[PDB]
Amino acid sequence: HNFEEIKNLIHTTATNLATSELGSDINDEGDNIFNGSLIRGTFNNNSIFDSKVHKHRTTTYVEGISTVEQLIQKFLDYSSTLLNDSLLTREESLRQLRKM
Amino acid sequence: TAFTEVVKPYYNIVEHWIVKGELIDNNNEFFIIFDQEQNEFNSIIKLLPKKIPAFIKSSDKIFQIGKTLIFLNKYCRELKWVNQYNVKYSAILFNNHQGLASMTTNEMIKLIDSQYNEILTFLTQIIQGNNKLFTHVYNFKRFYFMETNDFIDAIMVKGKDVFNESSVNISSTYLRKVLQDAIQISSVKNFEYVDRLDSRVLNPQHGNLGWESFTIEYKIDDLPMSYLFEGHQHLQYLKMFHF
Amino acid sequence: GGLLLQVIQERMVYYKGDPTSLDFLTQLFDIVSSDYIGMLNQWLLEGVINDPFDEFMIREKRVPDSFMEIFQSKSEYYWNELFLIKIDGLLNQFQNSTIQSKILNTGKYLNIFKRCTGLHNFESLKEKLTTITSLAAPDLELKIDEFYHRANKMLMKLLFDGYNFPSVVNIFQRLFLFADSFQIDNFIDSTFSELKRGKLKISVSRLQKQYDDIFKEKIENKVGVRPSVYDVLKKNQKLSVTSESLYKVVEELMD
Amino acid sequence: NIATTTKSREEELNKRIVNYKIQLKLMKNFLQELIDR
Amino acid sequence: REEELNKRIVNYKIQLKLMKNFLQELIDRNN
């Protein structure tokens, strides 16, 4: 039941990558900002906003797995689910299973 | 002669605030400031009407341009368009002209007006575009203001035994089972954003039963819109739902 | 070492309003920092550290010769412990956890790609790339994000299309969780009398062989015919008796 | 009192501890293999 | 009650960090 989700996700990722070229082109402008961007000194006050925001909201696995970190995390969560669901994580459940 | 070079740094502060949307002056010498102690976007930044200089124009538009820039490049994380905008308007401030100081008041006002229109156009195209503000407000009214009575009837019929016991006895798994069963029974299972729905118990007191604590919560945290809606509004959305 | 940039930035705060002094300090900072930008550009574009002065923040360290054989077997610790970030030499731009992680992981992923497919550099792909022009540029975060996405794109396609990871997942499912229980059923049937005997009262070496006859049997294929990933992973597996019983090993991570 | 939610809080904490017990023991085994040489 | 689990979590965070620092020390000394 848990493996069905991973199977579907990995199939979707395989199909997504099959049609995707290798290597991506990155372009940029002349960047004339100079002094309008240096912001030299100690620092700006924008540092507070970076800490204020949070990035704990990531879900829906849209278009499959897009980062290798999520690829590893999905399988780690799957293994943790297998251990927790089985009667081996608590002490009461493990003791009763061992006796049985 | 001295006032030109003395005022150039002030115009550099204004340039950084207008173009990229950042505050440079560490000392109190500008009519825009921050509040680190505040815990909501709309009130971290405040204006100082007493410190507005006489030689500056369209100050109340400068403030909005800077605030919307901060919002775009730090909450919505739309760095691509912010960079494109930065290049476009740096090519006018520093290439067409030689800075804000080397600009007549008429052209400076016109430039600020153009920036204001462009920025609010893009802010609309995001917030009421990709975010779909109206649709989520409609869903707020649909769920918090009881409109989809079938879903709530399904919750009450399915949870008629779970809610009987005290609020401390109800656990997370029973709530999840109740919510999923009610979603399947009712017509919300075909709803577009059925995933966002989530139930909770607010105050698990011994003297409070399940009926007096259950509250349905519509999750919009995944969107930048959640930062606009301060907690006070959500609390008033949970009070009216309770009644 | 890299502390000079901190001194210049500290020095530049007092002359922030002086035009000529600020221009001179900015020019000096720009030329001085160019080497650091070269190191960072090579790290993010090719995943190679070059200058042996240990100046760069991403500290790749050499494995001692005394442990070479150990680290080759457990490559996970090689690729997770012997790359570090030297916090002393970081500028305030990089003083952010997520940016540090993105830089380190982009470089590691490109290094993995090069070491796996054997390419010395990414000339064959002939892709157009933009380098970081300066540390004071406003698009540093955007450039890092783009480089990280490129590295993920390449490594993802390597793993899925080239190394056939999706089939490795099914192979692991079969071998470990018995998604196909026929073979393990034959194994248990063949060695039922042995398995139920006490640990020490039976020869250990026999179970290995009686397992290999069931699982890692083979028929060879002619030269040039591609092996299947299942074919490669069949011969890797080894079943051995261990002293740590299930009820004892699981108690730690609580005859 | 802390708000109750559909997701099991104690389950999440317990899974984190178990995943922290696997990393510790694997690291100990590796260090033992490293030290004895 | 769950304070106790959080306390144990942070204790194991420190222990893991110590083990990793031990690895780094050993490798630095062997080099």
Query: Three-state SS across chain E?
Result: CCHHHHHHHHHHHHHHHHHHHHHHHHHHHHC
CA separation for the pair B70, B47 (Å, rounded): 15
β strands within chain B, DSSP E? 32-34, 45-47, 197-201, 214-218
Task: Provide the shortest C-alpha distance from residue A65 to chain D (in Å).
Answer: 22
Rg for chain B, CA atoms, rounded: 25
If DSSP codes are grouped into helix, strand and coil, which group holds residue A15?
helix
Q: Which residues pair with D5 in a beta bridge?
A: B200
Q: b/e map of C225-240 (b: 16 or more CB within 10 Å)? A: eeeebeeeebeeeeee
Q: b/e map of C138-176 (b: 16 or more CB within 10 Å)? A: bbbbbbbbbbbbbbbbbbbbbbbeeebbbeeebbeeebe
| Angle subtended at Cα C116 by Cα C110 and Cα C117, rounded to the nearest 5 degrees | 95
Query: Locate tokens 């500056």: which residue?
Result: B56
CA distances (Å), C95 to each of B51, C88, C92, C102, C213, in order? Answer: 34, 10, 5, 12, 57
Backbone angles phi, psi at B84, to 5 degrees: -60, -45
CA separation for the pair C160, C168 (Å, rounded): 10
| Angle subtended at Cα B47 by Cα B41 and Cα B48, rounded to the nearest 5 degrees | 150
CB within 8 A of C230, min separation 6: which ones?
Answer: C167, C171
Rg for chain E, CA atoms, rounded: 14
Specify whether the CB–CB gap between B218 and D21 falls below 8 A.
Answer: no
CA separation for the pair B11, B9 (Å, rounded): 5
Q: What is the resolution of this structure in A?
A: 8.2
Q: Side-chain half-sphere of B28: how many Cα atoms within 13 Å? A: 5
CB within 8 A of B154, min separation 6: which ones?
Answer: B181, B182, B183, B185, B186
CB atoms within 10 A of CB D37: 8
CB within 8 A of C90, min separation 6: which ones?
Answer: C57, C100
Q: b/e map of C241-252 (b: 16 or more CB within 10 Å)? A: eeeeeeeeebee
CA separation for the pair B42, B68 (Å, rounded): 10
CA distances (Å), B154 to each of B146, B158, B218, in order? Answer: 13, 6, 17
If DSSP codes are grouped into helix, strand and coil, which group holds residue A100?
coil
D33 touches chain E (CB under 8 A): no
Task: Give the containing element (helix H, strand E) for D13.
Answer: helix D9-35
Q: What separation, in Å, do the N-terminal and C-terminal C-alpha atoms of chain C show?
A: 63
Q: Which residues pair with B200 in a beta bridge?
A: B215, D5
CA separation for the pair C2, B12 (Å, rounded): 30
CA separation for the pair B179, B209 (Å, rounded): 18
CB within 8 A of C84, min separation 6: which ones?
Answer: C58, C59, C61, E24
Contact (CB<8Å) D13/E22: no
Q: What separation, in Å, do the N-terminal and C-terminal C-alpha atoms of chain E show?
A: 47
Task: Provide the shortest C-alpha distance from residue B43 to chain A (in Å).
Answer: 13
Nearest alpha-carbon partner for C82 in C96, C65, C64, C95: C64
Rg for chain C, CA atoms, rounded: 27
At D17, list the tokens. Answer: 């501890």
CA separation for the pair A62, B56 (Å, rounded): 48
CA separation for the pair C18, C97 (Å, rounded): 34
Mode of pairing for the β-strands spanning B197-201 and B214-218: antiparallel
Nearest alpha-carbon partner for C58 in C101, C5, C116: C101
CA separation for the pair B149, B151 (Å, rounded): 6
C-E contacts (CB, under 8 Å)? 16
Quickly list DSSP for A45-97. STHHHHHHS------TTTTS--SHHHHHHHHHHHHHHHHHHTTTSSHHHHHHH
CB atoms within 10 A of CB B173: 12
Instruction: Choose among C74, C253, C254: nearest Cβ to D30.
Output: C74
CA separation for the pair E15, E9 (Å, rounded): 10
CA distances (Å), C65 to each of C44, C68, C71, C72, E30, in order? Answer: 28, 5, 10, 11, 9
CA separation for the pair C197, E1 (Å, rounded): 45
CA separation for the pair B112, B231 (Å, rounded): 33
CA separation for the pair C151, C46 (Å, rounded): 10
Q: Which residues pair with C85 in a beta bridge?
A: C58
Query: Locate tokens 């848990």: which residue?
Result: A2
CA separation for the pair A8, A4 (Å, rounded): 6
Touch E-A: 3+ C-beta pairs under 8 A: no
Q: Which residues pair with B214 in a beta bridge?
A: B201
Nearest alpha-carbon partner for C219 in C206, C228, C211, C208: C228
CA separation for the pair C148, C155 (Å, rounded): 11
Rg for chain D, CA atoms, rounded: 17
If DSSP codes are grouped into helix, strand and coil, which group holds residue A30?
coil
CA separation for the pair C185, C183 (Å, rounded): 5
Quickly list DSSP for B3-15. HHHHHHHHHHHHH
Q: Which residues pair with C84 in a beta bridge?
A: C59
Instruction: Choose among D22, D25, D33: nearest Cβ to C70.
Output: D33
Number of H helices, E strands in chain C: 12, 2
By CA distance, what is A79's nearest residue in D? Answer: D19
Query: Locate tokens 């590295």: which residue?
Result: C151
If DSSP codes are grouped into helix, strand and coil, which group holds residue B32?
strand
Task: Provide the shortest C-alpha distance from residue B16 to chain A (in Å).
Answer: 6
CA separation for the pair B66, B171 (Å, rounded): 47
Backbone angles phi, psi at A46, to 5 degrees: -70, -10
CB within 8 A of C69, min separation 6: which ones?
Answer: none
CA distances (Å), C28 to each of C10, C21, C22, C31, C147, in order? Answer: 14, 11, 10, 5, 28
Nearest alpha-carbon partner for B21 in B102, B75, B98, B96: B75
Quickly list DSSP for C33-101. HHHHHHHHHHHHHH-----TTS-SSEEE-PPPGGGHHHHHH-HHHHHHHSEEE-GGG--TTT-SHHHHH
CA separation for the pair B21, C85 (Å, rounded): 31
Torsion of CA B201, B202, B204, B209, to 10 degrees: -60
CA separation for the pair C25, C51 (Å, rounded): 26
CB within 8 A of A56, min separation 6: which ones?
Answer: none
Query: Locate tokens 């800077």: which residue?
Result: B66
At C14, list the tokens. Answer: 């007092």
Instruction: Choose among C67, C252, C253: nearest Cβ to D37.
Output: C67
Mode of pairing for the β-strands spanning C58-60 and B197-201: unpaired
Sign of the alpha-carbon dihedral angle for A73, A79, A84, A89 = negative
Specify whether the CB–CB gap between A22 and C154 falls below 8 A.
Answer: yes
Experimental method of this PDB entry: cryo-EM
* Chain A contact probe: residue of C156, C169, C229 with most A CBs at under 10 A: C156
CA separation for the pair B8, B11 (Å, rounded): 5
Backbone angles phi, psi at B137, to 5 degrees: -65, -40
